[PDB]
Design a protein around this nucleic acid. Sequence first.
RNA 1: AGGACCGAACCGACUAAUGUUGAAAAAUUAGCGGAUGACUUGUGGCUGGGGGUGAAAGGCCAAUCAAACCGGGAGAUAGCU
RNA 2: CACAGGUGGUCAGGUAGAGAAUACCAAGGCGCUUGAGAGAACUCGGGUGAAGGAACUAGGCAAAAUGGUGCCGUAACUUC
RNA 3: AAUUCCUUGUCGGGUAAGUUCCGACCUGCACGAAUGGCGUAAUGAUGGCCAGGCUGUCUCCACCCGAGACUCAGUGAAAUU
RNA 4: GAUGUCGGCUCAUCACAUCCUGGGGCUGAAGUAGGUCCCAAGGGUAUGGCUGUUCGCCAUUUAAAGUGGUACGCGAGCUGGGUUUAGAACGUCGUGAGACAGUUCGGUCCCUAUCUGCCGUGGGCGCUGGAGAACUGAGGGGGGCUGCUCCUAGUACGAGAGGACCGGAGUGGACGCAUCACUGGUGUUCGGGUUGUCAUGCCAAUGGCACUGCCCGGUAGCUAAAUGCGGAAGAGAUAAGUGCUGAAAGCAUCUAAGCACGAAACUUGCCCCGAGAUGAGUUCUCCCUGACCCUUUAAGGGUCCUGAAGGAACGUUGAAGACGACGACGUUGAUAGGCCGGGUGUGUAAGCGCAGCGAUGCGUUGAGCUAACCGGUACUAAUGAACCGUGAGGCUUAACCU
Lengths: 125, 114, 209, 56, 123
Amino acid sequence: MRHRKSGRQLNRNSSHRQAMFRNMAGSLVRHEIIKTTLPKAKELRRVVEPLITLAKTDSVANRRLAFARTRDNEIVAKLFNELGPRFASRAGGYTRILKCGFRAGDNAPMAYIELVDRSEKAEAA
Amino acid sequence: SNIIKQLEQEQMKQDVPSFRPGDTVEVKVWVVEGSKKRLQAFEGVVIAIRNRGLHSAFTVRKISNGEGVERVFQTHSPVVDSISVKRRGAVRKAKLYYLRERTGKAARIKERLN
Amino acid sequence: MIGLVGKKVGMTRIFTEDGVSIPVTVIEVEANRVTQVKDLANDGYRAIQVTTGAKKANRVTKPEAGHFAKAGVEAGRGLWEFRLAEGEEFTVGQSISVELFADVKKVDVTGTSKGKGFAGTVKRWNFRTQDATHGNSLSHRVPGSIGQNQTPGKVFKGKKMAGQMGNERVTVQSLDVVRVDAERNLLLVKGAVPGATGSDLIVKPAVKA
Amino acid sequence: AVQQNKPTRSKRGMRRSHDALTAVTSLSVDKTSGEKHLRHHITADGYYRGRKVIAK
Amino acid sequence: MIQEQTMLNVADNSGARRVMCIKVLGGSHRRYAGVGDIIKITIKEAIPRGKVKKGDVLKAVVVRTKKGVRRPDGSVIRFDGNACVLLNNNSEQPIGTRIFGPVTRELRSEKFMKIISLAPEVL
RNA sequence: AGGACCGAACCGACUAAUGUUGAAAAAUUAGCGGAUGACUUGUGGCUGGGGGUGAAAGGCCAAUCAAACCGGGAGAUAGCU
RNA sequence: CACAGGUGGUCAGGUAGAGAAUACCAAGGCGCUUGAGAGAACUCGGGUGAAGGAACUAGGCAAAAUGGUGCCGUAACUUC
RNA sequence: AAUUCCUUGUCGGGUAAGUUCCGACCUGCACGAAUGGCGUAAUGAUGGCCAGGCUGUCUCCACCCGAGACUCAGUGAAAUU
RNA sequence: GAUGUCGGCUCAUCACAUCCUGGGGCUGAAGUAGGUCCCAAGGGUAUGGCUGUUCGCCAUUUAAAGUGGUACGCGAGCUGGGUUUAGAACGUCGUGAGACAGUUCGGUCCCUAUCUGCCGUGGGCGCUGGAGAACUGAGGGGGGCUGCUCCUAGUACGAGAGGACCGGAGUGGACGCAUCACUGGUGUUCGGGUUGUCAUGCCAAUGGCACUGCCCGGUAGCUAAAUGCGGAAGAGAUAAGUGCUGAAAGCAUCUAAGCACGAAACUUGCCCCGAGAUGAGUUCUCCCUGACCCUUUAAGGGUCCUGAAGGAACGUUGAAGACGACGACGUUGAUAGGCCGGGUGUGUAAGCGCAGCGAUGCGUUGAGCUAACCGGUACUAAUGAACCGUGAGGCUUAACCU
Ligand SMILES: Nc1nc2[nH]cnc2c(=O)[nH]1
Ligand SMILES: [Mg+2]
Ligand SMILES: [Mg+2]
Ligand SMILES: [Mg+2]
Ligand SMILES: [Mg+2]
Ligand SMILES: [Mg+2]
Ligand SMILES: [Mg+2]
Ligand SMILES: [Mg+2]
Ligand SMILES: [Mg+2]
Ligand SMILES: [Mg+2]
Ligand SMILES: [Mg+2]
Ligand SMILES: [Mg+2]
Ligand SMILES: [Mg+2]
Ligand SMILES: [Mg+2]
Ligand SMILES: [Mg+2]
Ligand SMILES: [Mg+2]
Ligand SMILES: [Mg+2]
Ligand SMILES: [Mg+2]
Ligand SMILES: [Mg+2]
Ligand SMILES: [Mg+2]
Ligand SMILES: [Mg+2]
Ligand SMILES: [Mg+2]
Ligand SMILES: [Mg+2]
Ligand SMILES: [Mg+2]
Ligand SMILES: [Mg+2]
Ligand SMILES: [Mg+2]
Ligand SMILES: [Mg+2]
Ligand SMILES: [Mg+2]
Ligand SMILES: [Mg+2]
Ligand SMILES: [Mg+2]
Ligand SMILES: [Mg+2]
Ligand SMILES: [Mg+2]
Ligand SMILES: [Mg+2]
Ligand SMILES: [Mg+2]
Ligand SMILES: [Mg+2]
Ligand SMILES: [Mg+2]
Ligand SMILES: [Mg+2]
Ligand SMILES: [Mg+2]
Ligand SMILES: [Mg+2]
Ligand SMILES: [Mg+2]
Ligand SMILES: [Mg+2]
Ligand SMILES: [Mg+2]
Ligand SMILES: [Mg+2]
Ligand SMILES: [Mg+2]
Ligand SMILES: [Mg+2]
Ligand SMILES: [Mg+2]
Ligand SMILES: [Mg+2]
């Protein structure tokens, strides 16, 4: 059974699933909005939303912690410097999921995942 | 869960002394020695602590007559009268399950001076 | 005697004065308001229909709402009937408390078991597994032979086979009634009861010894 | 395990009784774009619940 | 949790050192023996001039187990090894005159009364 | 020194599971034997069908060898279906 | 067959290593031409298991186990 | 006994219990001297038997990680009748 | 123009010529224990050594270790040890090739389930206007085992030795269900230690890979070894049996009339399913109150207007789940995620300071981190809407009411 168990396997092993969510949580922080399949999108929320909760407090530890979680200094920068103080007031729920259509080649149900308070100027550059 | 926590703390002990793994405790327990109700002691190393409110337990190991004897005490049980730290133990891990394969001289636990 | 509808809060323990741990199941039994009294003249049998707790006004349909309306009681999560002993009498609207079991020694608890989903013969029927090795071919948990030969040349009805396990009506009998607390809408019973936390139960006084 | 008799065309037609599709009845129109889109789905021009949410 | 083929140490001066459980007595298909249940044993290792010899088939009361006994409060008592006490085949009484190691208060019953007195420690 | 020892490449193929409308008309995976020798391998050459070759299993001789394949006698014959 | 098979010779970076083993890497080359979900029985392939330890079975099949270097030390028998 | 039908021969050993094993006897249905007899150290992916260790082999299954199985989209077989 | 063989495993189902438990007649039955027969099929009915063995012998249990049928049940369920291939040997037979119904060593077990059957689970329509609940209970299934000790009583009984009936209490074995509070197992999503190597410039910290690299612990969950509960008592009608009254047959006679008893079998009783119970039942509540045309004029066909209750959809989901189904919630909102506080688990993070040549230690510091958990919180997402389903519902008769 699956009684009270949390977390999708997404037809991938632990190490793969982890690295995929490390890259994806990167891509979102960078482009502030990404298109992906709805199940992945819904799981990405459990990865990215606490990274921002970290970035709300600037510290050497917190920075290294988020670093070990992202493995990209470009992302840890954007987090503590920008997003943290952007979502400074906001008590969770830093992302939004917009269901779009269905992918061609495989009929997967797609979605957009964006940062609640989006910067169209940081997203393009 | 709210009702359950209410029913549990009203049954919970308030006087429990602090002890951690490594510490050598002397559990004074209520027993019926045939036609008598007296206190028996069980002085041994605390090798495990389970923290679960009312359901909190702990494992005490002693080497009685060459053989190892562990006892699992339910902390909030009325059976358990007193708990007393006889020596403060110095260990790293929270479960000293490795000790079960150690004898006499190898099994010694350093004193925690602090 | 009548029964009361309740809710499974969960299992805990009770430590006695003589240092014994009684394993208990906390049962939240709020008041059970009568919504219909069934009599021989109108229904052909004697029973009381009751409701308990509350239900979202928007979630209460026009037919349900009106049924409750007639009784002059607030809508509950559902309705359950209890057959009346010769003599037992109640009025519509009359509220029943867990204190009904205040002097009932043992009770029978009817719940809805947790659902295991599709279960194999090994779990479902306690079938013994075939050999793990010694040349066994893709036949470890399988049910083995399911019949004879030309005679009868069919599988008999009721054959123990894999299928849906759990999530069904289950009664546990003769459980010791540990505590009754009106003020706290509580019932304490020795031993486990069917169902998951938060599911509905039915407490009735023990039918057997 | 194969068949002993050819199943008939009626039997084929029978097995296929629950094979029919379900027309999407969930189409709504956007109060701003005047665009058909699925219920709880962004429009082809990136509109959702009247606001332009995606710039695509 | 003693069963057929389970080897046990001896908690007495009966002469036996190692005994093997050959049958869990006390009911058809009975699976396990626990602290205070009678078993049929075969002596596998024995001292040169003790009361019993190697190969002797007889009975035994289990006194200590690795699984151990439970108490009304939930309290467990685990021992480091499974050990029994040799019993006279028909009399179901102790072959030894002395008991070694600690035993539990579970034994206190009229037929195992001897064992708890002689016993050095009772838990 | 050695048809010496342990062990990769290389040469084998003892066990198990899988696979058995296979990934494969003989494999894969884990373990296994030999590994300076009667070792192993590239290229080219000789031996042809009652014939070859064979540390011999009727083995092998181009995916079925107690007598290869192709074509012919040929529509052999078939008291059999 | 765009097939887990078969196919002779040459080359031999770094750290660890006895090594051409193995592990991670370099240069270089690839993710194997259906994907998305879900997380039932059952099958394959793995990880861990309380107490017991061959009671399994035709048979310890299969697992599990052992595993390196140096030194100490090593029985019957023997063609030494 | 790779040989013994009667036969699980008899005895001794090992085990709680041993149609196998080891030792012994001889009544060899139907051993026997290069169709070699009888021994033998070493060697053996050889056959029988025992012990320690070891464990899901078993008591008696549990839980977990993966590839299928199931659902959606694309492609799209087979034996048989 | 193929019905796979012994034995095992897994799973069984029936008979009763009954192994145990139950009732009972005789006994060469004192008691205890037997012997024999009658009734009885409800449940129960060992594990090992040896051998391929079934069987059997043996060991040790047990209340018992039943006898048979089911293609000597069961290979499109597994095994392949026995037994018919091809290799080889011994004995024996034959000049020989070879042979044995003699032994011995080795030796390929395919099949994606169309029909029936069976286990689960849905879709349709029906039940006469539609709809939501709660029931009734025709019927079907499940279950049904038993040891030991104690009281009566060391009494009846017996010369003792011994040792009960009836009835009552307690505790087990085996089996079944449910549960996760406890003891635990697992827990590749939590925390720590560590080996090799590569990377983040480097130090310091970290991450990747090496079975989760190798390990130590462990949350929720699932779960057995864990801990609750069950078999019943009672009622009815009986079996074999035991009798009361009693003729036929002045007597006798359990039987012919009448009457009292009598079993784990049977019907109830307990548990589950259950009105497709088409014989489609009941109870309560809810919803709908426009016209027109045509024809073969009738339970006729169509059009306009209408679109209720309800169901469903779509979304967030669930200790519900293959899918379907079932439950919770959808802003008048805790349904999921996030967020806050707590718990739990791991075991004193980073950084800095001090001690030491250094490995390393100490203080800050029970630190840091912490999944599925408990208590909260609208921060993100659950949108106003659509679709199916209608528009007062047949005739006959009776009883009321007009
Ligand atoms: N979207 C939506 N919200 C609801 N809230 C309550 N009922 C409904 C419903 O049918 N649809
Ligand atoms: Mg896939
Ligand atoms: Mg890895
Ligand atoms: Mg109900
Ligand atoms: Mg479930
Ligand atoms: Mg088995
Ligand atoms: Mg196979
Ligand atoms: Mg297998
Ligand atoms: Mg068959
Ligand atoms: Mg028939
Ligand atoms: Mg050599
Ligand atoms: Mg090669
Ligand atoms: Mg290989
Ligand atoms: Mg070798
Ligand atoms: Mg070698
Ligand atoms: Mg050549
Ligand atoms: Mg030949
Ligand atoms: Mg001619
Ligand atoms: Mg011809
Ligand atoms: Mg390809
Ligand atoms: Mg290599
Ligand atoms: Mg184990
Ligand atoms: Mg262990
Ligand atoms: Mg051992
Ligand atoms: Mg055996
Ligand atoms: Mg066996
Ligand atoms: Mg092996
Ligand atoms: Mg291994
Ligand atoms: Mg043996
Ligand atoms: Mg001999
Ligand atoms: Mg060789
Ligand atoms: Mg045919
Ligand atoms: Mg009879
Ligand atoms: Mg007779
Ligand atoms: Mg029977
Ligand atoms: Mg007997
Ligand atoms: Mg047969
Ligand atoms: Mg097969
Ligand atoms: Mg031959
Ligand atoms: Mg034969
Ligand atoms: Mg009826
Ligand atoms: Mg982590
Ligand atoms: Mg460093
Ligand atoms: Mg029903
Ligand atoms: Mg420190
Ligand atoms: Mg927290
Ligand atoms: Mg109308």
